[model samples]
Target: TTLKMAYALSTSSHYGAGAEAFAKSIEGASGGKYKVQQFANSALGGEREVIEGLQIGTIDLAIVSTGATLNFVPETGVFDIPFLLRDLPHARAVLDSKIGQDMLAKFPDRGIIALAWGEQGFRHLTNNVRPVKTPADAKGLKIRTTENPIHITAFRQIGILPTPMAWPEVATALQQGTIDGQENPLSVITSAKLSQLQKYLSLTGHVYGPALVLMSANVYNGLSDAEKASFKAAGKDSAQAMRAYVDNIEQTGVEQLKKEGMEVSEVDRAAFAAAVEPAYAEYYKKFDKQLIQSIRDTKA
Candidate 1:
């Protein structure tokens, strides 16, 4: 069977790397029984749209952000709570723990099959305007954010003007001056060439974003037990590959962006985290306090 695997970024992105790795693993494991057709640059539409397609069986597979997936599975929004995830290692462990497994298990109830927890590393700030060294520096600046309200609330608490926009619209919005800046993982900034358009790069590491390898429940149910196992194994491979991409990009991407003429700045991340403390009241209202504390308590 030929499966369409869609993601929202260019072919050279971390999404592309993870998608290709999954395709390789599945095609080899199934001995050509399963062929993956890669759709890059939102050929199938935005992550939210592709996820909806999975529910309706219009799309067979997708690599999507939890930011967008929050709408379908509100339980996943707890991870989106700003500064909740300390760093990459801690973030990975939290998802690999019962916390992550339970979150992945939540998808089936929402009409999608989440295979594994792939990652996009931590998000950083980039803008065409002034450099952001602290939350005050980011004050009143219009920033493009995902429609995820968890993220919006944190940005609001930090004094940023959050403009919710889809991934497909971000490039044009930045170029047209519709928004002053955007935040994403370093992997995204380099792969999407965001440095070319944005002048300042701040290592905010605000949100530790995770991506999901999801399949249509209809397609998953039709698979044989052996095939299902192969798909699950393929998801593990995809997550490893995704994290490897992040590790490499995290170490080298900043220097590459600097060489490309992007002004790099490092924030006192502690101050930024402290600034979002007020947003916790709203977060506690939406998600369990114990669950949030459990994530923070998870040691590296």
Candidate 2:
């Protein structure tokens, strides 16, 4: 069977690398019975459309950020809590924990089957305008954000004119000066080559972004038990590869972006965190504060 797997990043991105690993593992495990035709750079559609396609079985597979999943499973929005994850290990551990598995389990009920959790690393700020060193610096700047409500609310609290747009359109918007900036993971910053369109990079590290590997529920349920196991195993291995790719970028992507001529700076994280505090009340209304606390308390 030829399976279609889609992601919103370039074919060279961590998501692409993970998709390649996923295809290889699944096909090899199944003795070439299953093959994946990968679609990168939102070739099939943006994250939202791809996910919706999965719900109706119009799409077979996808690797998507929690930002898009928030529309289907509001509980997944808990992962988008700004500054909620302390570090890479902490984020990975929280996702690997029962809490994470439980979140994944929430999918089948909603029309998709979650296979594994992937990483996009911590999100940072990049723009064509001045470097953002503080929350105040972001004021009056127009920034493109995912259509996630939590992100829009948080950015609003931070004082930017948050323009919600899909990934495929961001580059053109930035290049045409339709938006002044955007926030994404370092892996995304480098792979999307935002450095060419945006001039500044700030280590806001605001949100720890997590990606989900998913299949259409109908398609997943039709698989034999052994085939299901093979897919899960492949997903697990691919997730690790994707995480490793993100970690590598986190360690070295900044210098490379600088080499690409982007000005890099660090933001006052404390102040930025404080500015978004007002939005916590709204979040707590949707999620348990204790659950959020448990994620933060998770040991790397």
Candidate 3:
């Protein structure tokens, strides 16, 4: 069977790399019984659009950012709450544990199947106007954010005027000064060259996300036993690829950004974490309370 997949990011990023790896893994594991076609850089529309396609069975698969997935499954947006997961290790453990399993299990009800967790790393700040070292410094500044309610609410709570907009529109918005700044991981900021439009960055690991490798439930259920095995193997292999890429590239990316002349600073995160507690409380209602508590109990 032929599977069509799409992701919003460029082909070189982790999601794209993982998707490509999945394609290869499927070909090898299924002995040509399964085939995958990939659409990169929003060729199938944005992540949200692709996810909608997955839900309705128009598209077969995607390795998508949770920010985009949050639109269809609002409860998943709780992860968008600023400074929630602490660091990459902490995020990984939660995604690999029982809590993560439950979260992925929630998808079939929404018409999509989740294969495994992928990485987007942590969100950092970039701005043309000035350096944002603290939450107070971000006040009144316009920061581009996703349409996720949690994203908007968290930024608002931290005092930044969050502008919820589509990804394709973000660069132009930055160029025109429509938004004073934006936040993304080192990989994304460097790959997208957000630094070219901005002058400063706050290395604020405010939010971290694990992208999802999803298959259409209708399409997924139709797969043979061999194809299902191939699918799961591909997800595991590609998730490792995604995490390795995100973890390794970031240290180098920060230096590359500095060489390009962006002012960068390490932020104090304790206060930032404290400010978003209300967001967690509000968004956690969407998940099973016990699972959410398990995640909170995880020591990272």
C-alpha lDDT score of every prediction, in listed order? 0.91, 0.90, 0.81
TM-scores across all candidates?
Answer: 0.98, 0.97, 0.93
- lDDT tens digits by residue: candidate 2, 1-300: 899999999889999989999999999999988999998988888899999999888889999988678888888898888988878898899999999999999988899999999998999988887978889889989999998998998999978999999887888898899999899999988898788888898998999989999999878999999989999998898899899999788889988988999899987899899999899989989999899888878888
In TM-score terms, which candidate is top?
1
How does residue 58 of candidate 3 score in lDDT?
A: 92
Give me the displacement of residue 198 in model 3, in angstroms: 1.9
lDDT of 3 by residue, 21-61 (tens): 89899889888877888888778876778888998899998
How far does residue 29 in candidate 1 sit from its true spot (Å)? 1.2
Task: Give the true-structure RMSD of model 3.
Answer: 1.8
- Tens digits of per-residue lDDT for model 1, 36-100: 99999898888889999999998998999876888899888988877888888999999999999
Worst 10 residues of 3 by lDDT: 280-289
Show the colliding residue pairs in model 3: 83-206
In candidate 2 the C-alpha lDDT for residue 142 amounts to 95
